[PDB]
């Protein structure tokens, strides 16, 4: 009968034994306040696009698995300025 | 070195490399759902053994469905030399049906005609491993064989069958065992006392997926372009020493057809489809006092040499008018399959495609048989003057000539191979129209 | 539309006795897509769940194994299914000589 | 599969997170509406041994892609004395566009083309469409096959006859004047041996009309492949000595790859010196052994040990391309990298492209931009007694069989691209 | 067009959602241009049998991938007593790059990679290059050539380049075996006057022009590549009076594509079958010399059933079957059917967690990183078989195996997976330790 | 059904609630008194129960005979006896039907009864695995028995038929059950010697 | 084993020659769960 | 016969009180730490009639506190030392053998 | 490993190195009594 604790979503969480009483307690509240790169749960949007095929394209190519080059590839975090706290992966349960 | 070849660089190279677009270096893989594939055995309804009708409903333990083997056990009447894909001869048919709907069917002749088309090399060997005793086994060995199944959605994921989008319809695979097995129970015409009856045991190959693809399958209406097999059973017009005999089969299709099919053969002996002969491989005992032209090798029951092979000639006629100029047996036998899958393809096999690659998934062109009143297929046989059991007669002879034994082959298979649409919605699947 | 509404009896507007007494020709629960009820269904899914906080990704607690099914009305809707297969691209080559093509019927 | 799917950690955010790919639904990129025709060609100038004949190819679809030759030869002697009779019979290819040769395909390339670009299966039934291979005896009849390999012969490339409305496509086919075991065994002829029957047959493409008109009226730049082939004088082997040689290649354009064989004349396909061991020569293994004369029917191995080739490197504006690399390097390594097949021995391949068994693009060596591209070889030395298979297998990686100083001619091949520009109806190379 | 379409069957098609481009319309991609040179190493270390060499990749080029190692071994007996001996001599190599092991493959992975993954006219030639396939003959001399089967060793997609690794060297590890059989030992025993190999290491490195090179060497960057994790253990031999078993804990982490194994008979390199006097099984096998203590090398692997030991097999995952347990045919036969496309020898097994194993493409893995308790359960076959007597091996049933085959005591566990290889400013390492 | 082979049953909505579940089989002496022991539970090789493709438990014959073990007693294990084995000195060819009671955490007690009326989409079900031998019915010791008989096998759930009110709330009320679990794993024993 | 004098007396730290053949180990283990039932379906709550 | 090792990993755990705990709990934290950075090179090995000599490159990055070096005989664990007919230096060093 | 990321790695040369130069008088000692035999062992002795 918790009906005085942290709701995830529709959730009790329980850390260290007994159960998150508040925000406080979870190790996201370290870190509540950036901006932060990913959030670990990453609910999908929308269904996937589907893997388009082609009869053309793997005959010409005989394999070779020619990627394209001209992609965003996304960049990771620079040896010198530390790791930014952006860079810690939000675990919002709730 | 490489630097000396790099400066070497001109207009003829615009054209491949200026502006590039694309590397081979640094690859771009795609993320993807998470998924997992779980090998579950089904529980398949009705004793198993020979002639029996068994079946199965696959149960919902995934999201979708694709591989699906048959496991059999069966154990050998005679000594090596007297079986011919055996786990195949045993699977008579199967029919695919969801929510009473039948899909597809498939025949033990097809899968051996497929095979003799599609399948190449290792993958033809490892094939024949897992249908057949290809380590020179002897009388009483027992072995596990593994026979695919070859529908649309046991070759690639991309056709998996959503089997949670059908909560009203079941799909069941239905499973016909042959009466008799050749080298099992059987040799020739003749039962095998003491022969044992096959063990069998079918499994399906089912797709755990993650919430969020799972919630969408079963949610989503569902559209896929799958594919069906046509079977028409015909006599051949019977061959002969004196004559060119010549048929024209009036082919009841439908649907897109990537591929038309068929061989020829000798209902006796499955998988043959040549005649027999007194030369090595071609016939019981061949090559040696002892060969008999009436019972073939049965471990070596199929043949490149098309001498043996019953077709001289042939062309598909559509609504009266040629589809393609008539062409020579060894023309489907070889060119065809040259072309067209880049395997080999045995005598007595013969393939003709309306498609660019009808052995891939892709559409790349079909002749949708729907549209034609009238399909015929017009065949026109060798003489089948050769003495088959005279070496001479057999490997030195004409093009338009064949074996006395070709007169054995009475039976026709021809298949199609075609397009449909598979949908889902609410529950139910089935086949639709675009 | 009438996109149905995920309560804390029912989480998943599954409809499986669900609709005695209350909305017997229930409408269909919602795309999952439009109308985001899944932050909803999930927080309809716990109501008193209690997660290690080890669990990050919100998988140990089998939420594989809860759906939707594909019919969540009282009817298993054949006229979608059948209008899906069938019935398209009206006024056939048989009845009005305006829709045909010197080829045969559609296939 | 949930014990599974219930393992997920970081590391799999890589591949699964945020994911842009299904491997559970599929959708086709590419549609057709089109249709495939075999339609025979008219074959002008008589056909036999040693003649040229010709055909125009017809304006009976759109597009066009494989070419087959049919060719109807007889045995002039038992099984094991052919070799690839159909491929050795049709002596070479020109294709012509508008009166201007497009490319050129010899026998000898057939072979050599085979030898590294065919495989397993495909190779077999290869072997089935041009020789006899289930031990047929003299006087059979066989009808053969024979694939052309121009730049329009994968399903995805075709040749466009329908954007050429005033320009020809024309194939000159040169047939061998002898073809051993048919017509001729070794030097001499085959009395009553038969002529060849020759049909030529084309696999047309018939477009929609959206797709017919647009080929018929724009204009395109089709990127195509093309042989250059030159022969030369091979710098003898000797027991005496390691042969060496400095070939100068007249080659020119973007080359996916040099190819070459060392062979002796007389026999179609020998790239190796005969041997008194199993397959390695006429009656090899036994009393009966000649190593002056193969076994036709098992003219090609893998055995290194005859071929000629110690080492080569290809110099190019005078500098070092490579390193020095072994003749198995070429043999065997170089086509595991680049093709995936298996080489017999006495062919050699040494790519620029990553995978030149494709027709995209994948790395060049632009020869329009080298004055001097050398071919440098050191040849084994030839003091291995060929009656003596002790000596024939039992030897080092320096030397080779004394009859493998009968392998005199050489043959290097290059594989280009070239850019085949059409509009207006006519076309032609944009370089030569 | 469509009345001559309609006259060849009328061959109209379906269309999808997605754009759509008809079937010849295409085009060629421009590509970065680039060239590949092979350039020799220099080995430090003696070389000899049983002896570790070592080599630093020269930064000649910017990006390596293939890697051939030449030996040169000469015969010491016969044809026919030599099995891969080029492969047997490379005992293993390490792949270190800035002092961090990336990965690491055996003589034996080599040849359970070989026998799952490569195949038909591929696995021919890779026999040619790595034995004596032409019945040579003792004292035959020949320069082999055994590529590396790193991840950048297989496709140039994952090409490392060291232009962008400007601080961190890669090297190569590599250990030379003790005894290779049919070239300096004959079974256990020494072949006096055995020649001492010639090894020399070739890389294959990509030159690029210059906006490649400037994109490497100053950006990021991330590659997903294959990493070999292997254990080895003690089989729990078969007995010839049962049925043994065995559970193996498996010490794997990552996302694995799959996981592949094999029994085998350490003193014969390849030998992951029993012995027997039927045609190949055995030394002399079909007549009166045969001798079932010893293999015919030169056909040390075989595709006969009868000779394996594996009865049954299934995967736990944290206390759960993962799937049902399938006979080790399945392992051996369905398996590659369904996934490689290959044809795998008896004795060889193996299990996917992937559509697509056998391909660069991530497709399906199973995070071992996140399974406490993962374990390969085993069920091997009753060794009651008298394999002198080829009646009692042929026709013989599906769980009973050579008497012999007790003699494959040895079991080796393998496990494929994915990493990622960060690279920047110059350096770099995995980021899963 | 037969020796070693695979069979399996959904249990139909034929009630609102399940809660036992006993399998039947009917088997015949292979030998005399002396040659069986718990025969119907030595052919209960296994059984896997399942709700909506999740695996919830699975029961292993040797589980049976260890729970046995432990917790039975009395006259309790011996009617349990009498219900899987032939215990008043029964001779060759004696036929007999045997109930094995499952032990998963419903088969126990009503308060664990599955709601099926609460998982209308889902369905339950067992999987079972019959022995490929059966000691004194099959095989004695590792010989065959020549003429034993292939076993008859039953299996019935036992339902509970709720009235109104009740029924009413299964129906319409998500829940809760706090049930138990079965973890097993074989290992090797290291044997000890003289 | 054979020899009652020896089996039916002896020590308490040694058995019977014969139990070296009881060389399996059976090891269970008997846990809770959460069983949930909802829109009719139900699975547990800890995988 | 040779044996395989025994191996066990021990650790020594601390245990705090409900105070520091929580501040553990709660609060961010850093710590600046040690890491050893470390690659092999082959040795420009000296000989008889020569002094070698080398240049290798320190692929090393961070604040470095110290860097340490050794030559050695990789056959022998701890040989950073010549070998020699001296006690202690060699086996049997000092006697005939 | 601390989250799958490598902080740090020693070596078995490494720990002879740092000995080598950091540890000392007794406390080396009694380290070389931790990980040698240096009461005059013989073979077949056993330590932990």
Same mark, same amino acid.
């Given at each position: 009968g918790y009906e005085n604790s942290y709701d995830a979503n529709g959730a009790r969480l329980v850390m260290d034994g007994k159960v998150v009483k508040s925000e406080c307690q979870l190790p996201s509240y370290q870190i509540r306040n950036s901006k932060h790169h990913t959030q670990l749960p990453m609910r999908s949007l929308n269904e996937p696009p589907p893997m388009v095929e082609d009869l053309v394209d793997e005959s010409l190519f005989e394999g070779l698995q020619g990627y394209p080059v001209d992609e965003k590839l996304d960049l990771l975090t620079p040896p010198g300025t530390a790791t930014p706290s952006s860079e810690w992966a939000a675990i919002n349960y709730g | 070195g490489g630097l000396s070849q790099l400066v070497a660089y001109g207009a003829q190279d615009v054209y491949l490399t200026g502006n590039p677009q694309i590397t081979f270096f640094k690859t771009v893989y795609r993320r993807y759902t998470n998924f997992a594939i779980e090998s579950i055995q089904q529980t398949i309804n009705g004793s198993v053994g020979f002639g029996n009708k068994?079946?199965?409903? %696959?149960?919902?333990?995934?999201?979708? %469905?694709?591989?699906?083997?048959?496991?059999?056990?069966?154990?050998? @009447?005679?000594?090596?030399?007297?079986?011919?894909?055996?786990?195949?001869?045993?699977?008579?048919?199967?029919?695919?049906?969801? @929510?009473?709907?039948?899909?597809?069917?498939?025949?033990?002749?097809?899968?051996?005609?497929?095979?003799?088309?599609?399948?190449?090399?290792?993958?033809?060997?490892?094939?024949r491993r897992m249908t057949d005793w290809v380590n020179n086994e002897l009388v009483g060995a027992q072995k596990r064989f593994y026979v695919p199944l070859i529908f649309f959605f046991n070759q690639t994921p991309g056709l998996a069958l959503p089997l949670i989008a059908l909560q009203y319809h079941e799909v069941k695979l239905y499973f016909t065992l042959a009466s008799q097995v050749q080298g099992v129970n059987y040799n020739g015409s003749s039962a095998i006392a003491g022969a044992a009856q096959p063990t069998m045991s079918v499994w399906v190959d089912y797709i755990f997926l993650d919430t969020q693809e799972r919630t969408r399958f079963a949610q989503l209406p569902h559209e896929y372009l799958i594919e069906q097999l046509q079977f028409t059973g015909s006599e051949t017009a019977t061959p002969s020493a004196t004559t060119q005999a010549s048929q024209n089969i009036r082919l009841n299709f439908n649907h897109? &057809?990537?591929?038309?099919?068929?061989?020829?053969?000798?209902?006796?002996?499955?998988?043959?489809? /040549?005649?027999?002969?007194?030369?090595?491989?071609?016939?019981? @005992?061949?090559?040696?006092?002892?060969?008999?032209? /009436?019972?073939?090798?049965?471990?070596? &029951?199929?043949?490149?040499?098309?001498?043996?092979?019953?077709?001289?000639?042939?062309?598909?006629?559509?609504?009266?008018?040629?589809?393609?100029?008539?062409?020579?047996?060894?023309?489907?036998?070889?060119?065809?399959?040259?072309?067209?899958?880049?395997?080999?393809?045995?005598?007595?096999?013969?393939?003709?495609?309306?498609?660019?690659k009808p052995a891939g998934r892709q559409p790349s062109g079909t002749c949708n048989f729907s549209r034609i009143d009238n399909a015929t297929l017009s065949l026109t046989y060798k003489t089948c003057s050769i003495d088959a059991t005279s070496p001479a007669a057999v490997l030195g002879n004409t093009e338009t000539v064949t074996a006395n034994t070709a007169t054995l082959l009475t039976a026709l298979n021809i298949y199609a191979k075609n397009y449909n649409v598979l949908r889902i919605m609410s529950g139910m699947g089935g086949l639709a129209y675009a | 539309?009438?996109?149905?509404?995920?309560?804390?009896?029912?989480?998943?507007?599954?409809?499986?006795?669900?609709?005695?007494?209350?909305?017997?020709?229930?409408?269909?629960?919602?795309?999952?897509?439009?109308?985001?009820?899944?932050?909803?269904?999930?927080?309809?899914?716990?109501?008193?769940?209690?997660?290690?906080?080890?669990?990050?990704?919100?998988?140990?607690?089998?939420?594989?194994?809860f759906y939707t099914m594909p019919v969540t009305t009282a009817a298993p809707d054949l006229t979608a299914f059948g209008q899906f297969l069938y019935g398209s691209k009206g006024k056939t080559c048989k009845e009005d000589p305006s829709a045909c093509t010197p080829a045969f019927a559609t296939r």
């Open positions: - | 068994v079946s199965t409903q %696959i149960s919902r333990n995934g999201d979708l %469905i694709t591989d699906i083997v048959v496991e059999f056990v069966l154990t050998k @009447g005679g000594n090596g030399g007297t079986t011919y894909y055996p786990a195949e001869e045993l699977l008579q048919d199967v029919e695919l049906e969801i @929510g009473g709907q039948r899909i597809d069917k498939h025949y033990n002749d097809w899968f051996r005609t497929y095979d003799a088309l599609f399948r190449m090399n290792d993958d033809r060997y490892n094939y897109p &057809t990537k591929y038309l099919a068929w061989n020829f053969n000798n209902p006796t002996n499955y998988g043959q489809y /040549t005649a027999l002969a007194n030369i090595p491989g071609a016939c019981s @005992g061949a090559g040696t006092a002892a060969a008999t032209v /009436t019972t073939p090798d049965y471990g070596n &029951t199929g043949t490149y040499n098309e001498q043996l092979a019953v077709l001289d000639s042939a062309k598909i006629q559509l609504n009266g008018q040629d589809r393609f100029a008539t062409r020579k047996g060894s023309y489907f036998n070889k060119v065809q399959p040259y072309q067209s899958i880049g395997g080999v393809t045995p005598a007595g096999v013969y393939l003709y495609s309306f498609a660019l | 539309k009438s996109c149905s509404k995920s309560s804390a009896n029912n989480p998943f507007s599954n409809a499986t006795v669900g609709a005695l007494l209350d909305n017997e020709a229930r409408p269909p629960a919602c795309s999952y897509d439009d109308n985001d009820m899944a932050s909803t269904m999930r927080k309809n899914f716990n109501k008193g769940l209690f997660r290690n906080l080890d669990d990050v990704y919100e998988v140990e607690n089998s939420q594989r194994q």
